[PDB]
């Protein structure tokens, strides 16, 4: 009675959402974008190689200076690199070897990391003694720390294996907000340029837009046939792309609350590990589990180029805030800069 009536109300509101989305689906991005000049072939060259990690690299994140970058690795170390000079600005050994994520703070003073340990260890690079000292152990998550991004020097969002995300205030060591609702492990997230919104991708083959201010899911996007491994915002902040283990990427617009474009090719069979937009967003750089990192024209949906510079899975990648270079860390223990 109460549960069957509430289940049929759920399953009516769902088709009301599908119809509210189909209504706006008047034309595709492929139709409107047929005319624009194709991007051509993005011939990219390996500018740098970052040696020093002994095993798989699990994460990396550029600093806002577009020159420094953190990197987490299976060998249990958290290294800070100077991309321009290749020198290791810091080689921090970690308490847990199973680090999975890292995030250079936009301020550059703090860096955060975490992993299977179920703790988000926040480190201060500018320490009282100039050492690499641990500022905080943000504990409370009941699962492995899967990803995190600094809002400021005192606030940081982290996702975990409890199927939830959470905003923390570094000083209080307390979960400011808790983002519940997902039905699967949350693999990734992405802060909007406006720190009030962020999206998150999960293994149930759906993504969800959260309001940092309040902590509610604003929209939920589907379409992937498998887990979402990576997610990021379109530079403007009104759209975002998702990579999935279904060997396809997809674009979703928040205002249209539906998929705009699909990026895939029959040759590609392995899942997507990472994605990033160019400063303008015209280029989508997708990392794959075939040692490749394909460059797509986001508007034409055409595979503009291919980056094949790694010997193992291209696990992670990022783009500088100035779009000057692309970093790609991989299981080969080496990151590679591209231009």
């Amino acid at each position: 009675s109460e549960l069957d009536q509430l289940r049929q109300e759920a399953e009516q509101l769902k088709n009301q959402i599908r119809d509210a989305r189909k209504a706006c689906a008047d034309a595709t991005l492929s139709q409107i974008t047929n005319n624009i000049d194709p991007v051509g072939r993005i011939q990219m060259r390996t500018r740098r190689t970052l040696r020093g990690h002994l095993a798989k690299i699990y994460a990396m994140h550029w600093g806002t200076d577009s020159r420094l970058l953190v990197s987490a690795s299976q060998d249990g170390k958290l290294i800070i690199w100077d991309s321009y000079t290749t020198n290791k600005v810091h080689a921090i050994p970690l308490r847990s070897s199973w680090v999975m994520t890292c995030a250079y703070a936009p301020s550059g003073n703090y860096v955060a990391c975490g992993g299977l340990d179920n703790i988000c260890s926040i480190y201060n690079l500018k320490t009282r003694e100039g050492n690499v000292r641990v500022s905080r152990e943000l504990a409370g998550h009941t699962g492995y720390l899967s990803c995190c991004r600094f809002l400021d020097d005192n606030q940081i969002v982290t996702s975990s294996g409890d199927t939830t995300c959470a905003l923390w205030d570094i000083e209080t060591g307390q979960q400011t907000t808790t983002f519940t609702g997902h039905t699967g492990d949350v693999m990734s997230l992405s802060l909007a340029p406006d720190t009030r919104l962020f999206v998150s991708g999960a293994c149930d083959a759906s993504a969800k837009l959260w309001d940092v201010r309040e902590g509610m899911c604003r929209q939920t996007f589907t379409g992937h046939e498998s887990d979402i491994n990576a997610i990021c915002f379109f530079p403007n902040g009104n759209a975002f792309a998702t990579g999935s283990d279904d060997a396809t990427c997809r674009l979703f617009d928040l205002r249209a609350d539906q998929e705009l474009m699909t990026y895939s090719h029959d040759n590609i069979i392995c899942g997507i590990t990472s994605v990033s937009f160019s400063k303008s967003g015209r280029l989508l750089l997708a990392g794959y589990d075939d040692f490749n990192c394909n460059v797509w024209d986001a508007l034409k949906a055409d595979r503009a180029g291919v980056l094949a510079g790694h010997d193992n899975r291209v696990s992670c990648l990022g783009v500088t805030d100035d779009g000057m270079a692309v970093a790609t860390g991989s299981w080969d223990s080496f990151l590679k800069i591209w231009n």
Partner: protein, 937 residues
């Protein structure tokens, strides 16, 4: 306090009401009663003469006379009080009865048993604890229960039933679902044909009904009913009764496979009592909250939980002392857990005198609160580096308490040995070590973990990301000889419920857990409290073997492994008995669940009892390091079986010894033959009995020795080629039970290797092939002394293209001839494929023997293999097809082959484990295997 009514022995037996402190100690209570008695006694003289030791406190629990053995048990914990309170008994009654010294019957019985075992069970001259005697007292109850529930008739007859379904090549042998049975009665023969799927009882009822009227002609008394007969193989004592398909008996299937006829003879039901069991009179022998100081007043403190002590473990050495002078020396202690090194501590080099003193305290980084149940202080005396001695000591004793005081231990001198927990018996020329463990005003107990729900796994139930799942499963897919790197250990430990439902990972899961911590162990116990998938899993016997292996010492992991073994049927138990034995070596304690498993299987089968008896006797005589443990189990066993088994063991042991003496004496140097025959006639004069079930055959009795058929060979050891004669007049033929008795060559190898091959074929037969191998039974009896069976009509291949001429000639007909040709091929390829896996295929022809009937067997287990040209000439398509189907069939149980090859290579023989894999190597493996076959060609 509580009121208890104690019954004195003084006349009616005086009884008085007393009170005992609710939190007292057994002994005190004794004194309490002693004084009141001494004061109220009508004749206190009797109590004055004696003391409290002479009497024992017995209480009847529902008619069962229980004794309060341990003298330090908590008075409240006494089950008697709980039983009374549930019964509302007030005041409770306990009786006081003197210690009546033994009688003679019992001492003679004990002497008999000790003669059987080869070691005294009451020897206490090489012991530092009372562990052995308490094990002996404890084992009584399971044995009494196991004996209480069983059938006399079935056990005495011990049907060798089976429950596997027939292989292909044997189903055809049954035409129209029927088989031909020869029936003997007197010398009257009656051939009948009965369906292969009819149980023997129905067969006997039918045999009665068919010929009931002419029963006199068959020479059966007419007064007997159907109840008076059962079938019995002619020439054996292997009865055929019960409710089992007549196709499910290993002898029927052997007769079919080899192809002989089925001969059976009617027999009478052996009586139940003859297996009577010697009566026995040995009477019927917490949580962290209660065992911790915190939360309690110092006035009422009685014990300290081991987990409250944060002090780093510390041990004081005093010195070493060798009476005999054999440089720098130095002790090097190390805590170890199942070959895992927890912590170490060495000491400075010192001058090497016959006695060297240190009087130094070593401290271990591990904390007294972080000791697992069954760590093992290993103490070594290196030399300069070459190790010279070693010794080990349990840090928690057998009753959940820590070790405290001064201990002097004797040193074994240099495996399952280096993990030995016994003191050297040689107290005259052995290096001695003296150490001190600091005392404590109260016992250092160790509570029992309590099961608590673990939400870390309960609500963590959504499928993990496909990448992490891929990594997990890819890790689990390697062989157990793949060492788990720290990374993998951490990954698996976090994912400690993704693997809970995958049995094929359980000996990689528990190879990550870090026992040196308390939280880890508590969470492991929580994990193992939820084991639904494991419980109702597939009863594999390569997995439950890596659970009973060396690397593990827990009390619950082995518990679940044995709970899986609880289901096996008889034949399998018997298949892997040898290895179960080599496995009890690795135990941490004497009283375990593996030992009780072996004991409980031994008491409901006779073949199991026989094989267990001989294996344990061999190991006792051969392996002193654990001989006390083996002996305790073996004696706890021998008191359960029947009198007939005792008599049979006695006669068997008599014959083995007598021959021992004769043999060695001979090996001292027609002269030898004549002296041997004189000594054998003396043996007949020494009453060498003619009724002893041959050790490797519970049904095959030997008889009076045929003196002229014996001899001494010209080989190295020159064993005796005895030829006994059957001892049952209903033998279908007049063939001689042949044996060979060799001394000076290790006979542990041939035993294990034969179990290996015997399983290799049990796998092949599980795969509906038949390679026709000949596992002749061998059993070892002492150090470099072992009886071997004889393969009738055998010859040496080195002694003999001419091979096929020899064969042809031997075979008078081309039909039998080609039957032999199939045998020679099937069996020459089988043996090849099966020696190549083990890495011992390289052998000179001196160790290969061909049987006239077509079979080919190897001997003397001390190029891929031997595939000499003669083998090819005697043979080619079928050879290859069989070779491939074999190798492919074997590689489907590599986990088990490698487990065995290892669980043995350590306990037995003196990188070595790698070969098995280089050669184990689907299509690519076939190509390699055939490159190995065609290259030897």
């Amino acid at each position: 306090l509580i009121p208890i009514e104690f019954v004195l022995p003084t006349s009616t037996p005086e009884t008085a009401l007393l009170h005992v402190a609710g939190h007292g100690n057994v002994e005190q209570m004794k004194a309490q009663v002693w004084l009141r008695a001494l004061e109220t006694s009508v004749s206190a003289d009797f109590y004055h003469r004696l003391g409290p030791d002479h009497f024992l406190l017995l209480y009847q629990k529902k008619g069962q006379w229980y004794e309060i053995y341990d003298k330090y048990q908590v008075v409240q914990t006494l089950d008697c009080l709980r039983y009374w309170k549930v019964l509302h008994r007030s005041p409770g009654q306990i009786h006081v009865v003197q210690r009546h010294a033994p009688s003679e019957e019992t001492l003679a019985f004990q002497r008999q048993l000790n003669a059987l075992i080869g070691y005294d069970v009451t020897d206490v001259s090489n012991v530092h604890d009372d562990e052995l005697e308490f094990t002996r007292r404890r084992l009584v109850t399971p044995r009494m229960a196991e004996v209480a529930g069983r059938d006399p008739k079935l056990y005495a007859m011990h049907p060798w039933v089976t429950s596997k379904p027939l292989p292909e090549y044997l189903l055809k042998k049954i035409t129209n679902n029927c088989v031909f049975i020869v029936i003997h009665r007197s010398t009257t023969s009656q051939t009948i044909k009965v369906s292969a799927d009819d149980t023997p009882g129905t067969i006997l009822q039918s045999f009665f009904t068919k010929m009931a009227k002419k029963k006199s002609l068959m020479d059966i008394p007419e007064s007997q009913n159907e109840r008076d007969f059962v079938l019995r193989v002619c020439g054996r004592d292997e009865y055929l009764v019960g409710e089992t398909p007549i196709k499910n008996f290993q002898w029927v299937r052997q007769c079919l496979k080899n192809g002989e006829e089925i001969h059976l003879v009617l027999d009478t039901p052996p009586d139940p009592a003859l297996d009577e069991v010697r009566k026995e009179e040995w009477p019927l022998v917490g949580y962290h909250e209660q065992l911790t100081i915190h939360g309690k007043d110092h006035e009422s403190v009685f014990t300290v939980s081991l987990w409250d002590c944060d002090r780093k473990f510390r041990v004081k050495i005093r010195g070493i002392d060798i009476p005999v002078l054999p440089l720098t020396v130095f002790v090097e202690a190390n805590i170890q857990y199942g070959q895992q090194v927890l912590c170490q501590r060495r000491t400075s080099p010192k001058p090497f005198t016959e006695e060297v003193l240190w009087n130094v305290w070593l401290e271990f980084s591990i904390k007294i609160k972080d000791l697992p149940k069954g760590a093992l202080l290993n103490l070594q005396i290196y030399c300069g580096a070459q190790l010279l001695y070693y010794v080990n000591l349990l840090l928690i004793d057998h009753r959940f308490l820590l070790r405290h005081g001064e201990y002097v231990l004797h040193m074994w001198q240099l495996n399952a040995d280096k993990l030995t927990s016994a003191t050297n018996p040689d107290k005259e020329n052995s290096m001695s070590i003296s150490i001190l463990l600091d005392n404590y005003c109260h016992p250092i107990a160790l509570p029992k973990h309590r099961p608590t729900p673990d939400p870390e796994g309960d609500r963590v139930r959504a499928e993990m990301p496909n990448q992490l799942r891929k990594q997990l499963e890819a890790i689990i897919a390697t062989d157990p000889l793949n060492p788990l790197t720290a990374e993998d250990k951490e990954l698996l430990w976090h994912f400690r419920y993704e693997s809970l439902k995958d049995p094929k990972a359980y000996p990689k899961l528990f190879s990550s857990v870090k026992w040196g911590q308390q939280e880890i162990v508590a969470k492991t116990y929580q994990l193992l409290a939820k084991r639904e998938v494991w419980d109702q899993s597939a009863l594999d016997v390569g997995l439950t073997m890596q659970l009973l292996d060396c690397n593990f010492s827990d009390e619950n992991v082995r518990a679940i492994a044995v709970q899986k073994l609880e289901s096996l049927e008889d034949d399998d138990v018997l298949h892997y008995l040898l290895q179960l034995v080599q496995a009890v070596k690795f135990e941490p304690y004497h009283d375990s669940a593996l030992a009780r498993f072996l004991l409980k299987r031994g008491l409901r089968n006779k073949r199991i009892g026989h094989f267990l008896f001989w294996f344990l006797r061999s190991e006792i005589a051969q392996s002193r390091h654990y001989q006390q443990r083996f002996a305790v189990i073996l004696e706890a066993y021998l008191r359960g079986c029947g009198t007939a088994m005792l008599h049979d063991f006695t006669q068997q042991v008599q014959v083995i010894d007598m021959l021992q003496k004769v043999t060695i004496d001979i090996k001292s140097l027609s002269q030898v033959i004549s002296q041997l025959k004189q000594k054998l006639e003396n043996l007949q004069n020494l009453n060498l009995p003619q009724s002893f079930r041959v050790p490797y055959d519970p049904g095959l009795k030997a008889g009076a020795l045929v003196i002229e058929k014996c001899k001494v060979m010209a080989s190295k050891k020159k064993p005796l080629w005895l030829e006994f004669k059957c001892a049952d007049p209903t033998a279908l033929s007049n063939e001689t039970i042949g044996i060979i008795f060799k001394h000076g060559d290790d006979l542990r190898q041939d035993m294990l290797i034969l179990q290996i091959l015997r399983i290799m074929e049990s796998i092949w037969e599980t795969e509906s092939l038949d390679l026709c191998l000949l596992p002749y039974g061998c059993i070892s009896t002492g150090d470099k002394i072992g009886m071997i069976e004889i393969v009738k009509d055998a010859t040496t291949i080195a002694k003999i293209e001419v091979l096929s001429h020899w064969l042809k000639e031997k075979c008078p007909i081309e039909e039998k001839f080609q039957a032999a040709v199939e045998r020679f091929v099937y069996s020459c390829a089988g043996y090849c494929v099966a020696t190549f896996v083990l890495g011992i295929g390289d052998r000179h022809n001196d160790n290969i023997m061909i049987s006239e009937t077509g079979n080919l067997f190897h001997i003397d287990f001390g190029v891929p293999f031997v595939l000499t040209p003669d083998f090819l000439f005697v043979m080619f398509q079928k050879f290859q097809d069989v070779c491939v189907k074999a190798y492919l069939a074997l590689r489907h149980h590599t986990n088990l082959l490698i487990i065995l090859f290892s669980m043995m290579l350590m306990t037995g023989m003196p990188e070595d484990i790698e070969y098995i894999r280089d050669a184990l190597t689907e299509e690519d493996a076939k190509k390699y295997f055939l490159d190995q076959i065609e290259v030897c060609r």
